[PDB]
Design a binder for this molecule. Sequence first.
Ligand SMILES: Cc1noc(C)c1-c1ncn(C)c1-c1ccnc2cc(F)ccc12
Length: 120
Amino acid sequence: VKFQVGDLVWSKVGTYPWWPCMVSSDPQLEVHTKINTRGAREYHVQFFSNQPERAWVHEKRVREYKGHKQYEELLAEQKIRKPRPQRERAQWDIGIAHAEKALKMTREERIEQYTFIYID
Ligand SMILES: Cc1noc(C)c1-c1ncn(C)c1-c1ccnc2cc(F)ccc12
């Protein structure tokens, strides 16, 4: 286990770019990490965004969030660059603004400030 609840991470999920997240406990399983059905470790994350979402992400697709400028280092992992669709970019910028604020808080503060409320 490399990450704990409240840690800030970048997650690369599906067709989306590296996105700012917070590691959190799954509301149903009550664990923030598990071994999946393929025997790989996954972490449960909340995505920072105007649209609240959560996901279980493979450990190879999770990186420590040190700051927004780390994004260039993540892409690096003629020069070819994918375009940045304006609508997605605006939501990513909003997520980054939250992560930048969360980075200035302690773990306990971030947990209190950002942990989602799940309603059945
Ligand atoms: C959508 C969605 N629904 O479930 C999940 C899980 C996702 C998701 N998977 C990866 N990312 C980065 C997201 C996502 C989460 C929150 N906000 C967003 C805003 C966007 F513009 C674009 C993607 C996202």
